[PDB]
Design a binder for these strands. Sequence first.
RNA 1: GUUCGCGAAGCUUCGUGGACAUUUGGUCAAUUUGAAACAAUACAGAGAUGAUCAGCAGUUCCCCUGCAUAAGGAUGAACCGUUUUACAAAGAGAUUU
Length: 46
Amino acid sequence: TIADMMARPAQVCVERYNRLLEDEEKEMLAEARARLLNTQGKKATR
RNA sequence: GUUCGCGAAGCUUCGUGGACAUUUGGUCAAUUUGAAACAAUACAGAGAUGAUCAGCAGUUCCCCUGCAUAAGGAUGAACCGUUUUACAAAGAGAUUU
Ligand SMILES: [Mg+2]
């Protein structure tokens, strides 16, 4: 509620109050890139 | 043929005038060439979305099954692509008269 009132996120607000591998990456990125770019599927490609 | 009359031969038989009854059927003609479809082989192959799947519609000079204004057909079929002008105004530079 406090966070909402602020317009801030919650965890950060709370913190403030308190105060006072590579291969996988490569592969996933490749996949992701393919996905985001390609406006395709079964019917579009076919 | 039925018969109701006339005229000849022996009620029986020929020859006649009438009356009765009167125009069917085909948009077609019997095997390839006036248009049935499935099936089969081969080849691919399943709406969004990353994937899997439901259902509903929509457009059409596409239909099918269905008694159907039910319902169902690959989301039933094809739609997913191509896509450059009622086109003017302002500024700068260049060649021709
Ligand atoms: Mg279906």
